[PDB]
Design a protein around this ligand. Sequence first.
Ligand code: 3PE
Ligand code: LMT
Ligand code: SF4
Ligand code: SF4
Ligand code: SF4
Lengths: 128, 191, 123, 341, 61, 140, 61, 388
Amino acid sequence: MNTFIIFIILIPIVGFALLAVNILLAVYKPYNEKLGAFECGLTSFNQTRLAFNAAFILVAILFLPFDLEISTLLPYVMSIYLVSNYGFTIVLLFLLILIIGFVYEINTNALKINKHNKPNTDSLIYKL
Amino acid sequence: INIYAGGSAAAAPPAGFRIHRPATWEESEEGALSKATKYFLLAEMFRGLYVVLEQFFRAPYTIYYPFEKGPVSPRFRGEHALRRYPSGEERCIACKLCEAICPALAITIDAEERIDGSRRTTKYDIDMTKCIYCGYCQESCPVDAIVETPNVEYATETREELLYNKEKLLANGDKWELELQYALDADAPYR
Amino acid sequence: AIIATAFAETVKFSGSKQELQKRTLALYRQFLRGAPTFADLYEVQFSIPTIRTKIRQEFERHRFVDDLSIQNVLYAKGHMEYQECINFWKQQAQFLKYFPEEDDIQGRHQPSNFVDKFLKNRA
Amino acid sequence: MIINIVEILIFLVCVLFSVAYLTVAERKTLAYMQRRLGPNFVGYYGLLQAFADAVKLLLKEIVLPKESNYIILVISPLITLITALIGWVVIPLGPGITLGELNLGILFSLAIGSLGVFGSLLSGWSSNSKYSLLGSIRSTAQLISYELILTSIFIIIIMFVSSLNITTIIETQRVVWYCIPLLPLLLIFFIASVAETARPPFDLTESESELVAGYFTEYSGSPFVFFFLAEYSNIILISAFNGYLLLGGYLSFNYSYLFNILFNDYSYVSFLFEGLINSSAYAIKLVFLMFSFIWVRAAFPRFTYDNLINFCWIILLPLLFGIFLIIPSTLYIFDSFPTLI
Amino acid sequence: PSVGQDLPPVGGYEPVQWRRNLPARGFRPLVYLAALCGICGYGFYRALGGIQERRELKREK
Amino acid sequence: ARQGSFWPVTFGLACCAVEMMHVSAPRYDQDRLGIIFRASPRQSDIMIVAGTLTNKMAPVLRQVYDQMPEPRWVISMGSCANGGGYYHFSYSVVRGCDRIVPVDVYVPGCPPTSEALMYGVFQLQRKMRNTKITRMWYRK
Amino acid sequence: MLPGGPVPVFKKYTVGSKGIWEKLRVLLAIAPNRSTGNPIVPLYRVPTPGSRPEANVYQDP
Amino acid sequence: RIRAFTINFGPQHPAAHGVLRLILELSGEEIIRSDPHVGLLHRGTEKLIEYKTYMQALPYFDRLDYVSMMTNEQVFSLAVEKLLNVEVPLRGKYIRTMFGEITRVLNHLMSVCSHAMDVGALTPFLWGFEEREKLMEFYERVSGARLHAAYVRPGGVSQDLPAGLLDDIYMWATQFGDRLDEIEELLTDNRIWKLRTVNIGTVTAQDALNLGLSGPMLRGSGIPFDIRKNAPYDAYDKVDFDVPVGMNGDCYDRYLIRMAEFRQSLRIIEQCCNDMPAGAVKVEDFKINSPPRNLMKEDMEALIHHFLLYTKGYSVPPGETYTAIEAPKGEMGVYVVSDGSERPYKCKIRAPGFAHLGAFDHIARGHFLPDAVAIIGTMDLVFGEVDR
Ligand SMILES: CCCCCCCCCCCCCCCCCC(=O)OC[C@H](COP(=O)(O)OCCN)OC(=O)CCCCCCCCCCCCCCCCC
Ligand SMILES: CCCCCCCCCCCCO[C@H]1O[C@H](CO)[C@@H](O[C@H]2O[C@@H](CO)[C@H](O)[C@H](O)[C@@H]2O)[C@H](O)[C@H]1O
Ligand code: SF4
Ligand code: SF4
Ligand code: SF4
């Protein structure tokens, strides 16, 4: 029984203290419209999802590889002395190869949100 | 000197109405490194932070209300009151000009001949929940009977307490006569 | 520009009863098709048949009108109400103005002859 | 294990009451910046405002709407609060004065911070609402996007000290605090801290959603108290990360001369004064960083989601992928790759 | 007539400030960049010097 | 606790909201008394009806009121909300939020000054300060 | 100057600093011209509106 | 097919400063169609005015745009004066001008510092509202009400200025410039403000005219139009002020226009405090205006006229007029019809916010939702005037 172990178990199996205090002390007599949700608002049986832009999911899909890159750099910073001037060059090559993909990401503009209703920029020409 | 076709000397554009032209990245009187320092070091943002911090060391404007009140003037329009003469007789004479000018129709009056032959009211009611606190009644009265005190601290728990009647208004005048006298001595020459 | 809403119809006054006939029948069709939506959107305590009965009643109310322009105005206001109901702009409170019959019986004494109304001062 | 319980209870009490008074500090500092004063009426000088708020909330109904989920709505605050509080186990207030003296402390911090995203994820699932499920998505995108920058700064610091022991990272800064060689990283870490805490100028979905009927945290009662504790504890913990990475943690001037003057041998007064000085340093740094959070709330306007994602992924990460190359090169040029411990 | 009216003074009032008064402040930006570079260079001199001493202490250990 | 944390819902409909905002301003600081205006009713304890109540808006008012967790109170701010006011005889105005929701304190004015709304807040504070919670159970 | 600014502090009817604190404020200010907008209490809204002497001599213009 | 998703921005919510039901349709983040639903603050003002004398009807206008009261009653007074064919005295004109610009300062302090708050800047709101309090005190000292003064009436002004008000207004004016400067330090050159404002809500000059926009909304697109310079009404032909006009039609240009208008209003207030004439503040025709009390209580004609003006009212000649002012929101107008009676036959208020919120659909299409907040904030929408 170390203080670390005591704390990390005690926080979860005690965190419901004020939860129970609130459940026992506080009123609970619901209405229909107190179980409701808004000022106005409704939706028929149309669908279960909304159409979303690609960047919304691409940021999450690209979080995985860049996070794995930055987490794969942890062995290097914990081995930096032992891999002296060899692993340094190796991790630099690693970072350059992974910067090429970041360059691709920037040049494609993959996290940009595009706008449909463009403003009209075409001249007004009158057939005489 | 000039004849105009569908136009005017005023409708002609001013001398420099055509803006000069946008400025490109060339024709820049500011080096790239300097504006990049302003870009990376957040110059204007730190300046705004400092302008906010300068206020941290300035006097707060806050007045502690139940113990210190805010500025009131003789013209202020608050709770209503029916006034008397120094005789003790009531000033109102049932002329019904306040009932007539009231935009909200908050005043309700009924009158008849008193036992001593005098024109005096038997009913005088104000629905505060109709009133807009405009002062037209205080302007219309030719005897300074209906007035508006400087009071605002008369909130209630029930709306039936805001249907003021003649006795309430007369008691309110008997309560607030000194404040009303200060206000009148300050305000009457201007009205 | 300022574009119209979902179920908008440009105001176009028919110059014929035979065209307004088709327009009115189409609007009736649309109300009937949308009654399930009116029951789902507004938390309605009664049948979809009841909603369609009410629609038919309100369409029968103006059945024997013959002035064309009055019929045009009635069609326009009917389409306004359809757009207000199908697009969830109304609330239940305003939708249930059409349905006073479904609310419980308003008391015991509802006069229908003279002496009742007299005793209640409604004659 | 008696004194272990005592140490834990002292630490818990001090941390939680610091949170409760950070709420009041936020309000009063923002006020005096705004040429006002408040709160000053619900205790003497306003020192019971947070406890009044807590006691009110712990007597309110725990209404859960019709088309919502009971369990998720109720435990998401609690999971968020647990994860916010167990991150304090590794925070040292002295040379080894810690609850958890883990040699993998940085990774514990960086891994328990990885779990704070689940609160914002699961909040959206506590209703049959299709737009709150997108506000959830936007918030989670922000959080996972600035996690990378915090982790990158962690690794750039660990390039200088090859250890994941927080006390060792602090004791390496007896020479120089890492805010001096890496002053821009201090700005970047503070910015990413404000963004991870979802605090203004990065308060998009809270601001977004109070407009709409949904997409924010519409909790009542005890969930609400737990969320406030989580927020104002994560603020102090991310400022703690700032501290022990860049501002030296508990370090100050060297007080050997003063102690040799005042004392002649190790006593318990000596140890108490050492501890008070060290934790005083740590606390004044935390106070400055919390004041900075409040200042930034007072000063600037808000971002949009596009501007924010663009900020992150097109301005900040390029600099850091460059710094990943420049720091080991600077260590290679001068033969200064750091040893273990 | 006009007896007790609120009227202005004879020489009017001293003029007020209604134009923008946001003065330019601060050193030129390259001074701030030079200070940054010097701060960080000195910090690197101080830190890398400490890494070498730690390495020698490790040798001792 | 109910006094020192006094969180109304943001229900400003008309020109009485200007005085509410001035009660949040530096001269009169509502935050000094614990007051924080909360957007959603689920986090709120008070509803200050500050503005005229139109017949197109009353269902929304009642929905907002019913979404509030108990304990809940209502302040009627201004003549328009107290008894319809200036627009008492209109075709679109409700003659008081009394008709739609129950009211605990009526603040009169048009507009009621910031001081008057603060006096109303103090009157509701006195009401809740004289409220019997456990004592009434001990009677029941 | 121009006809519309800037104007010094001592020509602005606001309560400022005195002594070492003014010497510090003019050192730490973005614009020492700027004022702390607290009205001078001896001069602002004094005599009060309900105690003005001009009421006794006021006549209808 | 691009299926759209309908969100109600909220009958009750923060960004609307009042009560608005903005039914937006989105395809992702982008707005494609908007449908501002109004009438939630329709109180039947324009029918009530038909049952009121011209004096009883004047407080309807204080309560339309309730941050700019005196300008609304100014335009109604101008309309009824044009029908009555009476001339306001010079002192009344100067008072109306000075207080119209105080009212402009109040409106812009609300509008800019609520736009800021809705975009996220909380601190300018609380700075500017103290200056609002300082000016509300002048309102209260002249009229007796902090907000709804009922001061500017047909024929001039209700009451003369109290003693010692010009000195205090000058004392406020000596320091208001630094307040403006401190707000600008936070907002003007800021990156986040420019991001939230630059090239958002763009409207062209041609479309600005076609949609009926005026004020800053029309001046930000490049058209130099201001009714105070093109059709001066009270005293703006006797005071020097410049008009700010912007290119690019964005919200940043409107913000800069409103700050320039702050400074020009301060200029006008200085000139009016220096050049305030002597004399009467209302017309000296007791068939239109109430006489003084000391004559009503000593003169028979004065009392007769008091009685009639406060019971029946003054009868306006038959006719009709549309007159307008450069209200701080834009071109505010009143179309009055007179039937020779003491009560109007018809009073339509052309509120500047009605047209702007109607143009919301054209202006906000293609934008993201955070930008709709800025657009609502730069339109400066109070909903008493929208709904009347
Ligand atoms: C250091 C920390 C120390 C902490 C110290 C704390 C000490 C507490 C000592 C408490 C002893 C006294 C308790 C008296 C409280 C009662 C208060 C009261 O008188 O009534 C107010 C409230 C009313 O609830 P209600 O009966 O529904 O009335 C509706 C209209 N007001 O009454 C209430 O609030 C009652 C709350 C009851 C909460 C239970 C909710 C139900 C949960 C279980 C499910 C059972 C549901 C059954 C509902 C009925 C269904 C038909
Ligand atoms: C954590 C301890 C356990 C008990 C829980 C305590 C809960 C109390 C939390 C309060 C923390 C401060 O949080 C609060 O700050 C200020 C208070 O003025 C609010 O701010 C409100 O006030 C005004 C100030 O006049 C602001 O301009 C802002 O527009 C808003 O209306 C914030 O919207 C809210 O977030
Ligand atoms: S001041 Fe009040 S009571 Fe008198 S007329 Fe006006 S609204 Fe009616
Ligand atoms: S209060 Fe005055 S105006 Fe009204 S009826 Fe009496 S005397 Fe006439
Ligand atoms: S009571 Fe008066 S101030 Fe309040 S909303 Fe009604 S008219 Fe406006």
